[PDB]
Design a binder for these strands. Structure first.
Ligand code: MG
Length: 425
RNA sequence: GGCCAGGUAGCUCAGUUGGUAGAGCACUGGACUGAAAAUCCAGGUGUCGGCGGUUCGAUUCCGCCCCUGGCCACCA
């Protein structure tokens, strides 16, 4: 299979001129310090796919700290060195960020061994990457500038739309990929080929998913839910039995599946009308239903979660069937008010996950009715001017006139107020 | 530097239809007992992190900061 290709034309045509000049300069610097310079990762992939990619990952063969320190004087900005893994991050004044890493054999020799055929060193660095499409590099050195370097066939997999791991232990080294793969499947329209699907299933069933830290898995989950087709992602994780390994007490049934369908269907509506909605907590709302205190404590400790989330969830699971019967009997909005009263948008999404069709339209209508229709006059300071006073009572009265206003009867103010006061006797 | 969480008495911590402060312990004495391991009934605790805003009124609703913890900052 063909390894090297010429992307130079694609480079100059597609890439932003600023980033391009940065590439040129970095390559030249590399020639000056006798270090081969590459740009690697998602940038290459997106470059082939015609997608804008801001973050740039540079891989040099040599000391990356020396290369960065060398490129700092010529490039305005702030250098942050981490001497652990020999990596540096150079923040340019333009707002761009350059990530520079070291490619070396962990033995090698000094001075730097000259270029070897097939470029073993950089190959060794690209073998550690997750998927073939992210395993490709591009040489920035002026002589070789615009050289696409693909050992593992990431180009072929890019044309055929294939998600493929590098080796059999890929999911063992970084089980987070189990999620990421799925995300990629939904990021583009791509398919996970047979072997890595087997490797994924094996990885999940062997409990490598639980070994990894919570926050990373939560991060990849959040990234998954912000992609284009969340439903297909959730169902994909369901196929691989990922959901129960992430959340032990969550069992994915056709009922829960339908809930997720309604949920993702109604999320754009809530986001439109009620504003920004966290999709992670929106999904956990359905997932974490009927969790006992122990399990909730564990799942909250693993992936850090709001301590008040379980209260909202339990509120929903408390008022859901009653809500169903309310919408079934065409009950006035005054009775549906206390349930959705002070709740978060995520809670509202959860409620919407329980219904479709006529009940959906009705609940949305009542929702928009509650969102609007707030107040005109009277309330507290004006009730001070009147017979009542001193605390809770007047607030109760407020809720009364609000309820009479939500029942469909609205004319003016003190008329409804007088009705309420007459009913207080 | 990025992200996710917390701050409630001296300590560890609960508390959402906004509506006047909560539990165990820290803390003392006595009954039984020469004394103790011990249990019994028990004597009062708050700028609810800081500050604006909405409300008659905010620990709560919201925005901006202070502080603590965790994840991450080769691969990721
Ligand atoms: Mg980067």
């Amino acid at each position: 299979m063909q390894i090297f290709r010429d992307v130079s034309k694609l480079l100059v045509e597609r890439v932003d001129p600023k980033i391009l000049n940065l590439f040129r300069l970095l390559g030249k610097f590399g020639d000056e310090v006798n270090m081969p310079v590459y740009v690697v990762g998602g940038f290459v992939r997106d470059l082939l796919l015609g997608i804008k990619n801001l973050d740039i990952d540079i891989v040099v063969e040599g000391n990356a700290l020396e290369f960065a320190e060398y490129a700092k004087r010529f490039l305005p900005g702030k250098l942050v060195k981490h001497d652990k893994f020999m990596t540096a991050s150079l923040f340019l004044k333009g707002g761009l960020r350059i990530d520079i890493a070291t490619a070396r054999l962990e033995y090698y020799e000094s001075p730097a061994k000259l270029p070897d055929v097939e470029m073993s060193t950089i190959k060794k660095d690209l073998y550690r990457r997750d998927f073939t499409i992210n395993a490709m590099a591009i040489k920035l050195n002026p002589k070789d500038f615009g050289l696409l370097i693909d050992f593992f066939g990431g180009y072929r997999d890019l044309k055929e739309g294939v998600i493929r791991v590098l080796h059999t232990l890929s999911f063992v080294d970084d089980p987070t990929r189990i999620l990421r793969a799925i995300r990629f499947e939904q990021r583009f329209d791509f398919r996970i080929e047979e072997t890595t699907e087997r490797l994924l299933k094996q990885a999940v069933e062997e409990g490598y998913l639980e070994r990894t830290t919570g926050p990373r898995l939560r991060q990849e989950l959040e990234k998954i839910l912000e992609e284009k087709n969340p439903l297909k992602s959730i169902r994909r994780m369901a196929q691989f039995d990922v959901i129960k390994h992430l959340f032990p007490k969550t069992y994915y049934t056709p009922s829960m599946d339908e809930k997720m369908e309604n949920l993702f269907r109604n999320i754009p509506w809530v986001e439109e009308n009620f504003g920004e909605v966290d999709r992670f907590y929106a999904v956990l709302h359905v997932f974490l239903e009927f969790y006992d205190d122990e399990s909730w404590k564990e799942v909250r400790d693993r992936y850090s979660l709001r301590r008040n989330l379980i209260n909202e969830i339990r509120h929903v699971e408390k008022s859901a069937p009653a809500l169903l019967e309310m919408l079934s009997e065409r009950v006035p909005a005054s009775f549906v008010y206390p349930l959705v009263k002070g709740v978060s948008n995520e809670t509202i999404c959860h409620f919407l996950a329980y219904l479709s069709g006529e009940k959906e339209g009705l609940f949305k209508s009542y929702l928009l009715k509650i969102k609007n229709t707030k107040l005109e006059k009277i309330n507290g300071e004006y009730l001070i001017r009147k017979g009542i006073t001193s605390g809770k009572i007047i607030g109760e009265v407020l809720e009364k006139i609000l309820m009479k206003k939500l029942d469909g009867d609205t004319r003016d103010e003190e008329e409804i107020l007088e009705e309420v006061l007459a009913s207080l006797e």
